[PDB]
Paper text:
LTC4S is a trimeric integral membrane protein and a member of the MAPEG (membrane-associated proteins in eicosanoid and glutathione metabolism) family, which also includes three microsomal GSH S-transferases, 5-lipoxygenase activating protein, and microsomal prostaglandin E synthase 1 (9, 10). The crystal structure of human LTC4S has been solved and identified a unique horseshoe-shaped conformation of GSH bound at the active site by residues from two neighboring monomers. It was postulated that the lipid substrate LTA4 binds in a hydrophobic crevice between two monomers and that Trp-116 could act as a “molecular ruler” for binding of LTA4 with its ω-end buried under the aromatic side chain.
To get a better picture of how the substrate and product bind at the active site and probe the role of Trp-116, we synthesized three mimics of an LTA4-GSH adduct, termed analogs I–III. The phenyl ring in analogs II and III were added to increase the visibility of the acyl chain that was to some extent disordered in the analog I complex structure, as well as to stabilize its interactions between the protein and the acyl/phenyl moiety via π-stacking to Trp-116. The binding conformation, however, remains the same for all three analogs. Examination of the active sites in the five analog complex structures reveals a shift in the binding configuration of the GSH part that is similar for all three analogs.
Residue numbers in the entry:
A (entry chain A), B (entry chain A), C (entry chain A): -1 to 146
Write the structure that this text describes.
Amino acid sequence: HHHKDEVALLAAVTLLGVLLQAYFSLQVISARRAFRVSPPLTTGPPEFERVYRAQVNCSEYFPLFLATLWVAGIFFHEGAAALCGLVYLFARLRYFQGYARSAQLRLAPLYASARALWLLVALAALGLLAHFLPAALRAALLGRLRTL
Amino acid sequence: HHHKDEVALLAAVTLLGVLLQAYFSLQVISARRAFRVSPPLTTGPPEFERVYRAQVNCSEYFPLFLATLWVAGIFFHEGAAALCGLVYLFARLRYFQGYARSAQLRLAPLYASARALWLLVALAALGLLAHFLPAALRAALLGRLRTL
Amino acid sequence: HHHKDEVALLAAVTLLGVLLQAYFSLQVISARRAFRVSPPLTTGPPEFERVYRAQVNCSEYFPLFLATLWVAGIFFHEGAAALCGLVYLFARLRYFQGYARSAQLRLAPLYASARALWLLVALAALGLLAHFLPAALRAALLGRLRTL
Ligand SMILES: N[C@H](CCC(=O)N[C@@H](CSCCCCc1ccccc1)C(=O)NCC(=O)O)C(=O)O
Ligand SMILES: N[C@H](CCC(=O)N[C@@H](CSCCCCc1ccccc1)C(=O)NCC(=O)O)C(=O)O
Ligand SMILES: N[C@H](CCC(=O)N[C@@H](CSCCCCc1ccccc1)C(=O)NCC(=O)O)C(=O)O
Ligand code: NI
């Protein structure tokens, strides 16, 4: 047997996320051409700095997303986690587009991405609680018993 | 039984990648001493900014590499994925060395790293397609059948 | 059967790490308000630049930590890896607090975080060596045998 089936949606969402990050990167290179900024050096016009910063921020959050997606998907529920992941990634795409246009337009999709991510966290937390708390509670009761 | 055997090459390549990242970090600290830059603050001579930026970029791509390596290795083929990973990591080492010497010398190994990574993506995509597409196609046919 | 049991501590430490990263992020937003820095743009007073840089560095190391935690936990020993992970994360929290106050105060917890992480690396390396080296050594002997 294989456990590919138990994680395939997580893997698909993960790959989609990688692809999205790649898209962000190409958008950064394109802003580097458009606004004439050569590597190294990450300062230039406001629009470049916004696109660049949107990419940096997405990159910074991407491992957090992956970690929680997987923990939630394995410990809580695969489908829920994948859905939350899809919502998160879509929110991040909109974040990147907004930020690229204006700092303020990054905000609505930013909030959406954050809501989905904390939800992923909550599912992870609940799943882990479900795993550890019963055995822990039993062990505590046994020690009390004890009396006897 | 354990699934360590099914992922050991992925794990080895992963660890090698971590080690390589550590190497990049130590190279950055060494440039911080050589070109007299004290934390925080990441601006200084061109050579420092290049070494620093090479490290930043490698760091930024490292989770993307890990994600795709694992998805490709689990869904497509472990050995192929690990090989692509090795090529990628070697390419990144050369990227870092080039960039450290000159922005332009970062370019050839950069292209090599990108080719290997998209290959990892393609293997991931193919592996996932192989997982989902048959069941999906069957389900679609069944709905057509239906007639009857 | 499920392998949740074999990775639950790794998952818990991972989630704790994500939560800690989130904390760092909120601390950065709070410094953005306190020291009046609006996105994009990551320059401002020294204290902001230190908090920001502490967050950036933690973010940069977080995937390395995750990779090694998991490899060590799967290939060497789950409990040891999780413990090292806890020590690492605590060290990083102290790192962030120190850096936030003064660059120099980042140093002691920084060294602690590095010691724990290399230990994670060593466990990963030993676990992987244990997996590959016997089969490899046998294969080499068989080829020698050979004679005959
Ligand atoms: N923020 C960018 C860094 C990333 C980027 O936009 N481009 C990549 C290469 S983009 C090529 C295609 C996308 C890469 C990839 C990644 C993950 C999966 C698929 C494709 C890069 O290596 N830039 C720095 C350099 O030239 O050394 C920058 O610093 O300029
Ligand atoms: N780009 C660097 C950040 C990383 C770096 O080069 N050094 C590490 C520590 S390097 C020590 C050895 C390598 C760390 C490690 C990581 C992963 C696996 C093994 C070893 C660091 O913590 N720098 C910032 C700081 O002093 O607070 C910088 O901002 O100066
Ligand atoms: N270093 C920060 C980036 C991250 C940060 O501090 N805040 C997050 C949002 S913090 C909200 C709560 C924490 C997010 C989260 C992440 C992981 C798990 C749980 C919660 C952010 O999106 N900043 C940039 C922007 O406004 O576009 C900066 O560039 O200002
Ligand atoms: Ni199994």
